[PDB]
Amino acid sequence: WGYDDKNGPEQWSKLYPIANGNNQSPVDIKTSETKHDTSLKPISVSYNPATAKEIINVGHSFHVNFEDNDNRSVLKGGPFSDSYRLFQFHFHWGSTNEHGSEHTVDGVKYSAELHVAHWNSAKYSSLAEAASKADGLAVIGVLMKVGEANPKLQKVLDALQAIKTKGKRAPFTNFDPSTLLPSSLDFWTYPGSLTHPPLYESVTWIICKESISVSSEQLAQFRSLLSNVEGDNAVPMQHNNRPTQPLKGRTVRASF
Ligand SMILES: [Zn+2]
């Protein structure tokens, strides 16, 4: 699977039938059709820079993984009574600045998206087990709006030199991803999926109302990453965003 016509999102049906499911992500969020839920509590994050572990080029993207052996880095509140354990952050971007985000808001496409991923350690004993469970994952999505350079991205982009080609990995240490989060943690939530294969319908999405900035050149740094192995002809990662999928009668709640 990948993001080419050959093997891209419209092809994923073939090998992952769940692509045509009822809880697929991303979605377009229409703000006149969201329902304010008064039961939603604040989103609370408490992440430990010491849990930051590694950065990895996964061919279609790059992942920043976290030590998930204990509860030093957790998401709670919002729709949850279970505390959720940090394990990863990563981005999606598009071939152009116009569209790069996965989620859209009133049809507005953004330039890229940050996903910050957690698994349910209150109910399961590993990410592998939580991954396929309806209440397994909790993922904060942050829309990324082209404009001013985001210095908070610095360590991340600075790191990509060491993982230029597919399969390269590097230590990535002493980092707290909550520094990448917007000031206001007002959010929408809906039940959704992973946005690429295996595409499990295990994600409660937390989509931030407030975006964060990214410069056009910072984006070009993402696209500089190579999808090929060291030594092969260069194939840069031009894009890795899925089109938005039908809501199928789901409701997106607003905290605000
Ligand atoms: Zn993602």
UniProtKB/Swiss-Prot annotation:
Substrate binds at residues 195-196. Coiled coil: none annotated. Residues 1-26, 236-256 are annotated as: Disordered. Disulfide bonds: none annotated. Belongs to the alpha-carbonic anhydrase family. GO terms for molecular function: arylesterase activity; carbonate dehydratase activity; cyanamide hydratase activity; hydro-lyase activity; zinc ion binding. Zn(2+) 1 binds at residues 90, 92, 115. Pfam families: Carb_anhydrase (PF00194). This is Carbonic anhydrase 1. SUPFAM superfamilies: Carbonic anhydrase. Its EC number is 4.2.1.1, 4.2.1.69. Its cofactor is Zn(2+). It is found in: Cytoplasm. Signal peptide: none annotated. Activated by histamine, imidazole, L-adrenaline, L- and D-histidine, and L- and D-phenylalanine. Inhibited by coumarins, sulfonamide derivatives such as acetazolamide, benzenesulfonamide and derivatives (4-carboxyethylbenzene-sulfonamide, 4-carboxyethylbenzene-sulfonamide ethyl ester, 4-(acetyl-2-aminoethyl)benzene-sulfonamide, 4-aminoethylbenzene-sulfonamide), and 'prong inhibitors' BR15, BR17, BR22 and BR30. Activated by a short exposition to Foscarnet (phosphonoformate trisodium salt), but inhibited by a long one. Esterase activity weakly reduced by cyanamide. Its main location: cytoplasm. Catalyzes the reversible hydration of carbon dioxide. Can hydrate cyanamide to urea. It is an enzyme of class 4 (lyase). Residues 1-256 form the Alpha-carbonic anhydrase domain. It catalyses: hydrogencarbonate + H(+) = CO2 + H2O; urea = cyanamide + H2O.
